[PDB]
Write a protein that binds this ligand. Structure first.
Ligand SMILES: OC[C@H]1O[C@H](O)[C@@H](O)[C@@H](O)[C@@H]1O
Ligand SMILES: OC[C@H]1O[C@H](O)[C@@H](O)[C@@H](O)[C@@H]1O
Lengths: 480, 480
């Protein structure tokens, strides 16, 4: 046992603590950033470093009674692409067939130049494969309507149009920025004989999650828990909510009055809260966060909240900590492959360490670290690595509660009726599968200004239904 | 409006308040009663006024991988009888066919003499009708094993034997007390030609609820939430938990060592917490509670906790309050049928009042009161009636949390591993369908000694699986 190392680890773990006062600060600051983000854009939307707060042009929360013929949906996430067909049967029920495939590594590597046509041709081809397998008899005949879930910031101009503001996560395809992604996708669909497939809706994965929960929640369950947020804690992190039209001052005033006259009162806002406090005025920041933001990430200066929370980055934080402890001659990295191998340690690796037990000599930690980077470890080394992992994930979970607390506070969502609660629909591998992440989120909600009595009125529900149902709901509404 | 009536109602509502100090007192007192209840009693088990704390002789929580041929199950509740066949397919999955039938009124009336043979003959015929409908080709051939879920206190002597301690709810069949209900049931099965149906297990509906959740809970869901309590909040209320063998002092000391030598460490305990504090040393008590216990209930002096909590009695509490307000010449009962009609107001009636809205002039309340007893009401009267209902249900929900907090504290269940949470499997119409009952239970848990941090670690989950899966699991284990 090396006491000098144990004290160094304990001091690093302390850096990741987020106090109740910090949660209070970040909550009020987040609301401030929400209000500034709702004001008319000063600079160019692609270079604006504030909270994006992007109007989605979705104003109606599904009732659950929507019904229609089979819709198509395509969902480009941070890690996978999936095509599915959704049949909305009404009465909160649907039939879904889907195919999920990992985004080929070719699209995340910059060694060779990659273009938008490569990506959307690949997406179009998989769409063809899907229709061949599940709808072989009507692939080329039917007038398919498709909803496109695009989990990236888009300068939305209507339900069916919007230009990519900037890539996030692992994408760095240059020529896509500033282009309408619905058109890029439609062109590649046309060129392989699927011109009968009309992409008629474009949604963020947050928007789709909220719409899907509004539909599938039973009349009884929804009368108790009204869905008010659709958010994501997977490869990246983000969330949406319903904002009063009058407060969306960046929206064209005449368009606002038109919507208000039509009976609409709110529009869904894609906060893009991964880019909360990109200037680091208040977010906790360690030396490891700086190296991830400035050297190892594809988007330096953006998505900084996300770089402390989402699954793409938690494992890389551990890597930067271990490299620092080895530079100080406190931790022996052996013949591992950690050096010069960014993102080799994944959040999935960490998920095997979070609740590993010392009664098993932390063997899951031993096996997981050997599999990821061939890092052999002693028991005392694993004990200390577990302390670090638990500090990284707790900070991620505590920060994860801040945007939710802020939205609920700003919209006075908890001021309801007797026995009335709100649902926060959550999707993504971290919130769903990382041991304890949700529990720690709820702790941070209880420390937040909404208090423990507020946390009990909030239900973080895993919406594994998917944003495909949400995209399908938008396609049902739209015209072919 | 009516100031004198408003002040009387507001004063009654205050009498139903349960404070944090009371919850703490009742929680610690409940633990004391658990410990006294685990000591060997020498008195008549039917006359003991303490917490029964009945060993169930169930020592093994299912793994979820249990599999076998189709088992039978019989479930006598407080309101319905159901027979069902359960096919355990392993991997937390099962196939179930069931038939549910209401217990005939004949068994709840005392005008005509009722005997155990009447009850168990009728159950034998229903079992025959079930096997004729769903297993017509092997009714008389197969060597059926049946699990018997009997939701009443039983002096359990093995998994397959136990004498009725006393009826509860609406049952008062005299000659059943002191008789092995498995033998009574088996005799009538033999006597209608179903001697090939062997009743091989006898469980309380609490025990069955816990065993069912242990089986159906996925390995992943169960690794985060370990089921530690199976409880009921329906017609009656009760719960079970796993107690260390060493603490079950009423068990034969030699039998304890035999079980311990076999690798067993715990045995499920049927607390029978409906009979918590039958002597009213600390339970809140109103004049209305006394009238229910001494005049309108079948079992005066027993099940007093239950008579403040469970669905059989909540509506009757309101009736007795209105009769007192009419006795005081403050409320006009008009031409209603409340007088001399005990239990005419049901907990179902109250469920329509709990979340009725003034925006509808409380029309759900008006219709529910007219449907039940032809009680015409004004809007201002309904405003006050709603306050009474909300006071009755909150007191029920707050008291409902006390046994759960007590069990978790006694067994030190919430602080076991990092990220440690527990599942409390709840079944019954009240907890499942009464608006806000679970929400208010969680409030009371947070006020209890486990605190808000404890409540966040407790998952009150609705167990719609049923005690049939639980009974089937016991029958699969048992020998034909
Ligand atoms: O995938 C989650 C989330 O990741 C990033 O933060 C952004 O690309 C968002 O648009 C997206 O919703
Ligand atoms: O049915 C729930 C519960 O009701 C009463 O309290 C008793 O009959 C218990 O034996 C039973 O478990």
């Amino acid at each position: 046992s090396d006491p000098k190392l144990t004290k160094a680890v304990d001091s690093i773990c302390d850096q990741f603590i987020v106090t109740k006062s910090k949660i209070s600060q970040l909550t009020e600051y987040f609301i401030d950033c929400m209000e500034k983000g709702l004001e008319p854009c000063e600079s160019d939307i692609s270079q604006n470093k504030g909270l994006p707060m992007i109007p989605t042009f979705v104003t109606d929360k599904p009732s659950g009674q929507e019904h229609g013929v089979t819709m198509l949906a395509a969902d480009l996430g941070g890690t996978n692409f999936r095509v599915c067909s959704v049949e909305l049967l009404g009465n909160h029920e649907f039939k879904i067939e889907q195919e999920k495939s990992k985004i080929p590594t070719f699209f995340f590597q910059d060694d060779h130049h990659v273009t938008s046509k490569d990506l959307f041709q690949h997406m179009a081809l998989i769409t063809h494969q899907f229709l061949t397998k599940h709808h072989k008899d009507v692939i080329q005949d039917y007038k398919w309507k498709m909803g496109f879930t695009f989990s990236y910031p888009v300068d939305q101009t209507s339900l069916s149009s919007g230009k990519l503001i900037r890539w996030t996560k692992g994408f760095k395809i240059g020529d896509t920025v500033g282009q309408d992604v619905v058109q890029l996708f439609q062109q590649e669909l046309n060129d392989i004989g699927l011109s009968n497939v009309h992409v008629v809706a474009l949604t963020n994965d947050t928007t789709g999650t909220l719409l899907a929960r509004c539909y599938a929640s039973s009349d009884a369950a929804r009368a108790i828990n009204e869905p008010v947020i659709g958010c994501i804690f997977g490869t990246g992190t983000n969330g949406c909510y319903m904002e009063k039209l009058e407060n969306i001052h960046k929206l064209d005033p005449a368009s606002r009055e038109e919507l208000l006259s039509q009976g609409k009162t709110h529009m869904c806002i894609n906060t893009e809260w991964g880019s909360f406090d990109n200037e680091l005025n208040h977010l906790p920041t360690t030396s490891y966060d700086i190296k991830i933001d400035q050297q190892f990430s594809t988007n330096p200066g953006f998505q900084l909240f996300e770089k402390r929370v989402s699954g793409l980055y938690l494992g890389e934080i551990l890597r930067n900590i271990l490299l620092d402890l080895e530079k100080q001659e406190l931790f022996d990295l052996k013949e591992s492959v950690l050096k010069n191998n960014p993102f080799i340690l994944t959040t999935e690796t960490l998920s095997h360490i979070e609740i590993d037990t010392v009664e098993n000599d932390l063997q899951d930690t031993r096996d997981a670290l050997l599999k990821a980077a061939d890092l052999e470890t002693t028991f005392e080394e694993r004990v200390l690595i577990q302390k670090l992992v638990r500090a990284i994930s707790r900070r991620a979970a505590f920060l994860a509660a801040v945007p939710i607390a802020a939205i609920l506070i700003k919209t006075n969502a908890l001021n309801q009726s007797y026995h009335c609660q709100v649902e926060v629909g959550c999707d993504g591998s971290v919130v769903e599968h990382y041991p304890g992440f949700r529990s720690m989120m709820r702790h941070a909600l209880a420390l937040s200004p909404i208090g423990p009595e507020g946390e009990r009125d909030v239900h973080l529900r895993i919406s594994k239904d998917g944003s495909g149902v949400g995209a399908a709901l938008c396609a049902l509404h739209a015209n072919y």
